[PDB]
Write an enzyme that holds these catalytic residues in place. Structure first.
Site, PDB file in Angstrom:
ATOM      1  CE1 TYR A 178     -39.244  25.764   3.992  1.00  0.00           C
ATOM      2  CE2 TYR A 178     -39.931  27.841   3.092  1.00  0.00           C
ATOM      3  CZ  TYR A 178     -39.073  26.780   3.102  1.00  0.00           C
ATOM      4  OH  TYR A 178     -38.004  26.700   2.250  1.00  0.00           O
TER       5      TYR A 178
ATOM      6  CG  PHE B 249     -40.880  33.784  -0.977  1.00  0.00           C
ATOM      7  CD1 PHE B 249     -39.865  33.120  -0.313  1.00  0.00           C
ATOM      8  CD2 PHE B 249     -41.758  34.543  -0.227  1.00  0.00           C
ATOM      9  CE1 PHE B 249     -39.777  33.184   1.085  1.00  0.00           C
ATOM     10  CE2 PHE B 249     -41.661  34.614   1.137  1.00  0.00           C
ATOM     11  CZ  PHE B 249     -40.658  33.952   1.784  1.00  0.00           C
ATOM     12  CG  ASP B 250     -38.938  28.372  -0.262  1.00  0.00           C
ATOM     13  OD1 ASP B 250     -39.087  27.299  -0.882  1.00  0.00           O
ATOM     14  OD2 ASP B 250     -37.971  28.605   0.524  1.00  0.00           O
TER      15      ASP B 250
ATOM     16  CB  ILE C 138     -34.606  34.978   8.240  1.00  0.00           C
ATOM     17  CG1 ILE C 138     -35.940  34.223   8.371  1.00  0.00           C
ATOM     18  CG2 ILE C 138     -34.116  35.117   6.809  1.00  0.00           C
ATOM     19  CD1 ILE C 138     -37.086  34.961   7.702  1.00  0.00           C
TER      20      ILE C 138
ATOM     21  CE1 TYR D 298     -32.765  35.245   3.325  1.00  0.00           C
ATOM     22  CE2 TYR D 298     -35.142  35.414   3.314  1.00  0.00           C
ATOM     23  CZ  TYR D 298     -34.002  34.661   3.365  1.00  0.00           C
ATOM     24  OH  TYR D 298     -34.126  33.301   3.483  1.00  0.00           O
TER      25      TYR D 298
ATOM     26  CG  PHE E  13     -42.434  32.395   6.547  1.00  0.00           C
ATOM     27  CD1 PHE E  13     -41.873  31.666   5.535  1.00  0.00           C
ATOM     28  CD2 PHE E  13     -41.807  33.570   6.946  1.00  0.00           C
ATOM     29  CE1 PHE E  13     -40.704  32.090   4.924  1.00  0.00           C
ATOM     30  CE2 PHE E  13     -40.638  33.983   6.340  1.00  0.00           C
ATOM     31  CZ  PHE E  13     -40.095  33.253   5.344  1.00  0.00           C
TER      32      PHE E  13
END
Ligand SMILES: [Cl-]
Ligand code: NA
Ligand code: NA
Length: 128
Positions: A45, A55-56, A75, A101, A118
């Site tokens: 991902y 962010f990731d 999540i 979140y 995502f």
């Protein structure tokens, strides 16, 4: 770009029909089976915030992200979204904060009340 497109053109995959999780299938996967609750699922991902910042990314770590589906280990948007995917599928998900979140956010990078984008690839799933 891709976040705008899923926002405007995505499918609501929530049971409540509250548009909290929107999906576009980008690459059709194999067969017709989707994972089962409790399966170990392996994903790649990348996530972006609504300000455009990444962010990731699991790709950058050279290893997949592994979790047990449907158990609240991720999540809510991921439990719902990954459950819809076939092996080999790539999708885009647009996740409102109530399915992510929330007001808490998640340090160090995810602010309060954040809508998340995502791209997710379902690599495999296995019933342990
Ligand atoms: Cl884009
Ligand atoms: Na597009
Ligand atoms: Na699917």
């Amino acid at each position: 770009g891709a976040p705008a497109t899923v926002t405007e053109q995505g499918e609501d995959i929530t049971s409540k029909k509250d548009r909290g999780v929107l999906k576009i299938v980008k690459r059709v996967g194999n067969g017709e089976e989707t994972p089962m609750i409790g399966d170990k699922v392996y994903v790649h991902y990348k996530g972006k915030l609504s300000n455009g910042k990444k962010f990731d990314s699991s790709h950058d770590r050279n290893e997949p992200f592994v979790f047990s589906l449907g158990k609240g280990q991720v999540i809510k948007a991921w439990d719902i979204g990954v459950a819809t995917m076939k092996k080999g599928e790539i999708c885009h998900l647009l996740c409102k904060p109530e399915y992510a979140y929330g007001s808490a956010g998640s340090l160090p990078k995810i602010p309060s009340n954040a809508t998340l984008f995502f791209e997710i690839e379902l690599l495999d799933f296995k019933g342990e």
